[PDB]
Design an enzyme around this catalytic site. Structure first.
Site, PDB file in Angstrom:
ATOM      1  N   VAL A  16       0.815  -1.209   0.000  1.00 35.54           N
ATOM      2  CA  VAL A  16       0.000   0.000   0.000  1.00 35.54           C
ATOM      3  C   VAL A  16       0.854   1.266   0.000  1.00 35.54           C
ATOM      4  O   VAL A  16       0.306   2.379   0.002  1.00 35.54           O
ATOM      5  CB  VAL A  16      -0.985  -0.006   1.192  1.00 35.54           C
ATOM      6  CG1 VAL A  16      -1.902  -1.200   1.110  1.00 35.54           C
ATOM      7  CG2 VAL A  16      -0.244  -0.066   2.510  1.00 35.54           C
ATOM      8  N   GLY A  17       2.176   1.125   0.012  1.00 38.54           N
ATOM      9  CA  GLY A  17       3.084   2.240  -0.018  1.00 38.54           C
ATOM     10  C   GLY A  17       3.591   2.724   1.318  1.00 38.54           C
ATOM     11  O   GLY A  17       3.834   3.934   1.458  1.00 38.54           O
TER      12      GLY A  17
ATOM     13  N   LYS B 134      13.383   0.190  11.198  1.00 40.95           N
ATOM     14  CA  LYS B 134      12.765  -0.841  10.370  1.00 40.95           C
ATOM     15  C   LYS B 134      13.270  -2.143  10.961  1.00 40.95           C
ATOM     16  O   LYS B 134      14.281  -2.699  10.493  1.00 40.95           O
ATOM     17  CB  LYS B 134      13.159  -0.696   8.900  1.00 40.95           C
ATOM     18  CG  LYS B 134      12.830  -1.873   7.961  1.00 40.95           C
ATOM     19  CD  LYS B 134      11.362  -1.931   7.669  1.00 40.95           C
ATOM     20  CE  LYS B 134      11.088  -2.691   6.381  1.00 40.95           C
ATOM     21  NZ  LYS B 134       9.685  -2.473   5.893  1.00 40.95           N
ATOM     22  N   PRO B 135      12.625  -2.624  12.035  1.00 38.76           N
ATOM     23  CA  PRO B 135      13.201  -3.753  12.797  1.00 38.76           C
ATOM     24  C   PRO B 135      13.426  -4.980  11.945  1.00 38.76           C
ATOM     25  O   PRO B 135      14.515  -5.563  11.975  1.00 38.76           O
ATOM     26  CB  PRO B 135      12.154  -4.011  13.889  1.00 38.76           C
ATOM     27  CG  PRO B 135      11.332  -2.754  13.971  1.00 38.76           C
ATOM     28  CD  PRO B 135      11.391  -2.086  12.641  1.00 38.76           C
TER      29      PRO B 135
ATOM     30  N   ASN C  93     -13.119  -0.508   4.400  1.00 33.17           N
ATOM     31  CA  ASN C  93     -13.244  -1.623   5.337  1.00 33.17           C
ATOM     32  C   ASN C  93     -11.907  -1.938   6.007  1.00 33.17           C
ATOM     33  O   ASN C  93     -11.792  -1.920   7.238  1.00 33.17           O
ATOM     34  CB  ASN C  93     -13.801  -2.837   4.598  1.00 33.17           C
ATOM     35  CG  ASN C  93     -13.833  -4.040   5.455  1.00 33.17           C
ATOM     36  OD1 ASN C  93     -14.539  -4.059   6.461  1.00 33.17           O
ATOM     37  ND2 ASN C  93     -13.042  -5.051   5.100  1.00 33.17           N
TER      38      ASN C  93
ATOM     39  N   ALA D  27       1.029   8.823  -7.831  1.00 35.52           N
ATOM     40  CA  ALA D  27       1.460   7.492  -8.227  1.00 35.52           C
ATOM     41  C   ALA D  27       2.853   7.527  -8.842  1.00 35.52           C
ATOM     42  O   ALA D  27       3.213   8.468  -9.553  1.00 35.52           O
ATOM     43  CB  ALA D  27       0.454   6.897  -9.222  1.00 35.52           C
TER      44      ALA D  27
HETATM   45  O1  KSJ Z   1       6.707  -4.746   3.687  1.00 41.01           O
HETATM   46  C1  KSJ Z   1       5.826  -5.049   2.829  1.00 41.01           C
HETATM   47  O2  KSJ Z   1       4.602  -4.904   3.119  1.00 41.01           O
HETATM   48  C2  KSJ Z   1       6.275  -5.635   1.477  1.00 41.01           C
HETATM   49  C3  KSJ Z   1       6.981  -6.981   1.811  1.00 41.01           C
HETATM   50  C4  KSJ Z   1       8.117  -7.360   0.857  1.00 41.01           C
HETATM   51  C5  KSJ Z   1       8.050  -8.937   0.765  1.00 41.01           C
HETATM   52  C6  KSJ Z   1       6.642  -9.379   1.337  1.00 41.01           C
HETATM   53  C7  KSJ Z   1       5.965  -8.098   1.817  1.00 41.01           C
HETATM   54  C8  KSJ Z   1       5.602  -8.187   3.302  1.00 41.01           C
HETATM   55  O3  KSJ Z   1       6.312  -7.613   4.076  1.00 41.01           O
HETATM   56  C9  KSJ Z   1       4.391  -8.967   3.797  1.00 41.01           C
HETATM   57  C10 KSJ Z   1       3.659  -9.762   2.925  1.00 41.01           C
HETATM   58  C11 KSJ Z   1       2.571 -10.485   3.391  1.00 41.01           C
HETATM   59  C12 KSJ Z   1       2.212 -10.406   4.725  1.00 41.01           C
HETATM   60  C13 KSJ Z   1       2.927  -9.616   5.604  1.00 41.01           C
HETATM   61  C14 KSJ Z   1       4.023  -8.901   5.137  1.00 41.01           C
HETATM   62  O4  KSJ Z   1       4.779  -8.111   6.022  1.00 41.01           O
HETATM   63  N1  CTN Z   2       3.034   7.118  -4.199  1.00 42.25           N
HETATM   64  C1  CTN Z   2       3.565   5.801  -4.513  1.00 42.25           C
HETATM   65  C2  CTN Z   2       3.258   4.724  -3.738  1.00 42.25           C
HETATM   66  C3  CTN Z   2       3.747   3.485  -4.014  1.00 42.25           C
HETATM   67  N2  CTN Z   2       4.538   3.330  -5.063  1.00 42.25           N
HETATM   68  C4  CTN Z   2       5.059   1.990  -5.423  1.00 42.25           C
HETATM   69  O1  CTN Z   2       4.587   1.033  -4.505  1.00 42.25           O
HETATM   70  C5  CTN Z   2       5.654   0.106  -4.229  1.00 42.25           C
HETATM   71  C6  CTN Z   2       5.385  -0.632  -2.952  1.00 42.25           C
HETATM   72  O2  CTN Z   2       4.985  -1.971  -3.194  1.00 42.25           O
HETATM   73  C7  CTN Z   2       6.879   0.997  -4.249  1.00 42.25           C
HETATM   74  O3  CTN Z   2       8.097   0.280  -4.352  1.00 42.25           O
HETATM   75  C8  CTN Z   2       6.594   1.906  -5.442  1.00 42.25           C
HETATM   76  O4  CTN Z   2       6.980   1.265  -6.650  1.00 42.25           O
HETATM   77  C9  CTN Z   2       4.838   4.400  -5.850  1.00 42.25           C
HETATM   78  O5  CTN Z   2       5.545   4.258  -6.794  1.00 42.25           O
HETATM   79  N3  CTN Z   2       4.353   5.634  -5.557  1.00 42.25           N
END
Ligand code: KSJ
Ligand code: CTN
Ligand code: KSJ
Lengths: 226, 227
Positions: free
Chosen positions: A14-15, A38-39, A148, A199
Site C-alpha cells: 500500500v506504499g 525498520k526492525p 473496510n 502514483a
Molecule cells: O513490507 C511489505 O509490506 C512488502 C513486503 C516485501 C516482501 C513481502 C511483503 C511483506 O512484508 C508482507 C507480505 C505479506 C504479509 C505480511 C508482510 O509483512
Molecule cells: N506514491 C507511490 C506509492 C507506491 N509506489 C510503489 O509502490 C511500491 C510498494 O509496493 C513501491 O516500491 C513503489 O513502486 C509508488 O511508486 N508511488
C-alpha cells in the site's frame, strides 16, 4: 524524549515505505532531525531494502534495523523458511528507545499490515507501538475495499489505545476514477487525511521526491510533531 | 428460531458469493432447509446478482433481496450515485427475521467485507449480526496479506461478541505455492478452516457444483449447524 510514530498500513504494497520516506523528507525540510527504524525486513533476495530506499529518497542517515530475511513473505514465514527465529520484542523496543531523542522524529516501519508478527512471541507493530507510547499513521489505498480495511485497522488501534495520527493514501492515481474520488472523500470522513502521494513517486530522484513530499503534506501539521 | 449465519469476508472479491452457494448446497444435501438473503446488492447495472448466482449453482429457491443499486461500488456510494437511500437498520434485520424458521439455515450474504456500511449511519453487517444473534462465517484468500486481514476481521467480530463460525478459503489453487501453503497453514492456526473451495468452482454446472460443495465441507460440521 521526542516523537515516535509507527508507519503501518492496511496491507502489503500500500506504499508504507514511500510514505515513510516522504514524511521523513517533509520532516527534515521543516528542520526536524529524523530517524527511521525498520526492525524486520524481508525480501532481501529480490533486493528489497526499505531502509535504503528511505536513505536514498529522503536523505535519512539514522536508519536502524535488526533482522533481514531473504524470502518475500511476512516475517514469521521467512524466518521459518530460514531456520531462524525473529528478533525478540525486547530488541525492538530497546532499539527504538535508544533511537528516540528530543527534537527527533523517529519513524518506526513495520512489515505488511498492523497485526503481522514482527517479533517472538506473537508480537505485532501494534504491541511495539504501545510499549513506546507511539501514535500510528495509517497508509491506505484508494482502491475498492479500502474503507473496510481502514476501519478495521483504525479499530484495531483504538482497541489498544494506540492513537491514530491519520491516513496517507500511499498511491494517488492519475486520473483518479469514480471509485478513487469516492473513497478519498469517504476516507476523509473516517479520519484526517494528511497526504495523497502521486502514483509512481517512489522512482523519483532525491530532488523531485523532496518537492513532492514538501507539497504533499501540510507544513503546520508536520512542524507540529516536535 | 433456527440458525442464522452471516457470510462476510476480509474484503471484496474473496469468494463470499460462491461460498454462500457452497455451504447452501452442502446444507441442502444434508437435509437442511436453506434460505439465502442479500440485504444490499450493488453492481446491478453490470448484471451483478448474487442471489441469482446462488440459486443457479446450488438451486436454492428461497432468495430475498431488499436494496438494489446500479453501480459496482460500496453501497453508500452506489446509493448516493443513484440518488437513492440506504435501507434502514431495522429493515435489514426484518428481512432476516422473516426468513428465520426452526430447522432452517438462513445465510445472510454481506456486501464486500465486514465493516462496509449497509445502512445509515455506519450500520455494518456486524451490527446486524448482533441484532439477529448470528454467527459469522469469514471468507478469506490464501494470498499474501490474508493473515493480517483475517486477524483484523476476527478481532472485529470478537469486539462485538459476534461468534466466528470459522473461515473458508474462497479460491484454492492447484497446486499451491509456498505462500498459499504458508497462509492456509497459518490461517488454520488462528481459526477453523471449514473449507477451501477449488478455483473457478463458480463455473461448475449444477451437478459438479453440488459434488464440489458436498466434498468441500465436513458433513458433520454442516449438519451440526441447525438442530
Ligand atoms: O513490507 C511489505 O509490506 C512488502 C513486503 C516485501 C516482501 C513481502 C511483503 C511483506 O512484508 C508482507 C507480505 C505479506 C504479509 C505480511 C508482510 O509483512
Ligand atoms: N506514491 C507511490 C506509492 C507506491 N509506489 C510503489 O509502490 C511500491 C510498494 O509496493 C513501491 O516500491 C513503489 O513502486 C509508488 O511508486 N508511488
Ligand atoms: O460484495 C462484493 O464484495 C462484490 C461487489 C461487486 C461490486 C462491488 C463489490 C462490493 O459489493 C463492495 C466493494 C467494496 C466495498 C463494499 C462493497 O459492497
Amino acid at each position: 524524549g521526542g516523537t515516535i510514530l509507527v508507519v503501518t498500513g492496511t496491507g502489503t504494497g500500500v506504499g508504507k515505505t514511500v510514505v515513510c520516506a516522504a514524511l521523513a523528507s517533509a520532516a527534515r525540510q521543516a528542520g526536524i532531525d529524523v530517524a527511521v527504524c525498520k526492525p524486520v525486513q524481508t525480501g532481501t533476495a529480490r533486493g528489497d531494502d526499505d531502509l535504503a530506499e528511505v536513505g536514498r529518497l529522503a536523505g535519512v542517515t539514522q536508519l536502524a534495523g535488526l533482522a533481514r530475511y531473504p524470502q518475500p513473505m511476512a516475517p514469521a514465514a521467512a524466518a521459518e523458511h530460514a531456520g531462524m527465529a525473529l528478533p525478540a520484542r525486547d530488541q525492538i523496543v530497546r532499539l527504538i528507545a535508544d533511537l528516540d531523542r528530543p527534537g527527533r522524529l523517529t519513524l518506526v516501519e513495520g512489515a505488511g499490515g498492523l497485526l503481522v508478527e514482527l517479533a517472538e512471541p506473537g508480537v505485532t507493530l501494534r504491541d511495539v507501538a504501545v510499549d513506546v507510547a507511539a501514535a500510528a499513521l495509517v497508509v491506505v489505498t484508494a482502491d475498492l475495499g479500502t474503507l473496510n480495511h481502514t476501519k478495521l485497522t483504525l479499530e484495531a488501534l483504538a482497541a489498544q489505545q494506540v492513537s491514530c495520527a491519520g491516513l496517507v493514501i500511499g498511491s494517488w492515481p492519475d486520473p483518479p476514477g469514480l471509485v478513487a474520488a469516492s473513497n478519498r472523500s469517504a476516507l476523509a470522513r473516517i479520519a484526517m487525511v494528511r497526504a495523497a502521494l502521486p502514483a509512481g513517486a517512489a522512482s523519483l530522484d532525491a530532488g523531485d521526491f523532496a518537492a513532492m513530499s514538501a507539497a504533499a503534506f501540510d507544513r503546520n501539521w508536520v512542524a507540529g510533531l516536535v
